[PDB]
């Protein structure tokens, strides 16, 4: 017997050129900005983390209020899009996810630290390819 | 930096006194019966778009037969996804809408609990497939199965 695991997907979603059709599952690490604009979440795939912007569109077309309290729960991102926040205060630009539809999963688990996906060299190369063509 | 795990849920679901209000992730172990897509217009080719697909799904602890409904199959997006399931064994399957049903003995096979899936999604994650006992081989499940049977 054993347990089923989720495999990383964030880095692949960013390096890919196509928009994610199928959904992605990851763990909710932190609620940066909860819902009352959408909400800002820190999501992990076990290997990397990414800030996800859950649009208002997604908050309305959802079952269910507020994400705080579900930290550690798995999260289904049904509608994703990789975007680029541009450099502002000293900090460079970063990739992030805009989520237009999501769904909470039952599995709850301890939260483990993970590096940000923008710290990955392949991701970084691609970022500095978007900025030098935008 | 760690492994994200999925919580076993099949035995707890069947024994619980209610239906899965929320989605559940599992792994496709085997394809007992794949499903063909519906083709408009007559043909001398056998049509089976009435039958849905039948999968053996694991949750890491137990396995359970899943009947992926026709509705579920046609309300799905098959972009860069050959309509079907063979080839996806080892992939994570998310049952977004389902329920526990009883199957009375028939055709040589004894009564058992199984899941009807009216909506699913395929996750990218692929993983090794570990031998796992069927949930119906569980003592408490069997006791409930017979309890259910004694109500027809």
Instruction: Report the alpha-carbon distance of residue B25 to residue B9 in Å, rounded.
Output: 9
Sequence spans of domains, chain A: 1-134
CB atoms within 10 A of CB A118: 19
For B1-152, CATH gives 2.40.50.960
Residues of chain B positioned with their CB less than 8 A from the CB of A108 = 7
Residue in B with minimal Cα distance to A27: B4
Contact criterion met (CB < 8 Å) for B125 and A25: yes
Buried b / exposed e along A56-66 (16+ C-beta atoms within 10 A): eebbeeeeeee
Architecture of domain A1-134: Beta Barrel (2.40)
**A104 and chain B in contact, CB less than 8 A:** yes
Residue pair B95/B115 in contact by the 8 Å Cβ criterion? yes
Between strands B63-68 and B112-126, the pairing is parallel
B125 in A contact zone (CB under 8 Å): yes
Measured between CB atoms, does B5 come within 8 Å of chain A?
A: yes
What is the C-alpha end-to-end distance of chain A, expressed in Å?
Answer: 51
CB B10 within 8 Å of CB B135: yes
B105/chain A closest Cα distance in angstroms: 28
Question: In angstroms, rounded to a whole number, what is the distance separating the alpha carbons of residues A122 and A47?
Answer: 14
A 16-75 near B (Cβ less than 8 A): 21-27, 44-47, 74
Q: Residue B45 forms beta bridges with which residues?
A: none
Q: Which residues contact A72 (CB under 8 A, 6 or more apart)?
A: A27, A28, A108, A109, A110, A111
Q: How far is CA B130 from CA B18, B94, B123, B127, B134, in A?
A: 29, 18, 18, 9, 12
Tell me, rounded to whole angstroms, the distance of Cα B36 from its chain centroid.
17
How many Cβ atoms are within 10 Å of A26's Cβ, its own excluded? 25
DSSP codes of every residue in A86-130: PP-SSS--EEEEEEEEEEEEEEE-------BGGGSHHHHHHHHHH
Q: Are A98 and A53 in contact (CB under 8 A)?
A: yes
Experimental method: X-ray
- B126/chain A closest Cα distance in angstroms: 7
CA pair distance A118, A125, nearest whole angstrom: 10
In chain B, beta strands by DSSP E: 24-33, 53-58, 63-68, 91-103, 112-126
CA dist B144 to A79, B15, B16, B152, Å?
39, 7, 10, 14
CB contact under 8 A, A47 and B1: yes
Closest among B54, B52, B53, B61 to B14, alpha carbons compared: B61
Count other C-beta atoms under 10 Å from residue A54's C-beta: 26
């Amino acid at each position: 017997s054993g347990r089923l695991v989720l495999r990383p997907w964030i880095r692949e979603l960013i390096l890919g050129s196509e928009t994610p059709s199928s959904p992605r599952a990851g763990q909710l690490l932190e609620v940066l900005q909860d819902a009352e604009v959408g909400a800002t979440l820190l999501v992990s795939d076990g290997t990397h983390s990414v800030r996800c912007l859950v649009t208002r569109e997604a908050l309305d077309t959802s079952d269910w209020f507020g994400f705080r309290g579900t930290e550690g729960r798995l999260l289904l991102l049904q509608d994703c899009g990789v975007h680029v926040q541009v450099a502002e205060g000293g900090a460079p630009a970063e990739f992030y996810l805009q989520v237009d539809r999501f769904s909470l999963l039952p599995t709850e688990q301890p939260r483990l630290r993970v590096p940000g996906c923008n710290q990955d060299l392949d991701v970084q190369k691609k970022l500095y390819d978007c900025l030098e063509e935008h």
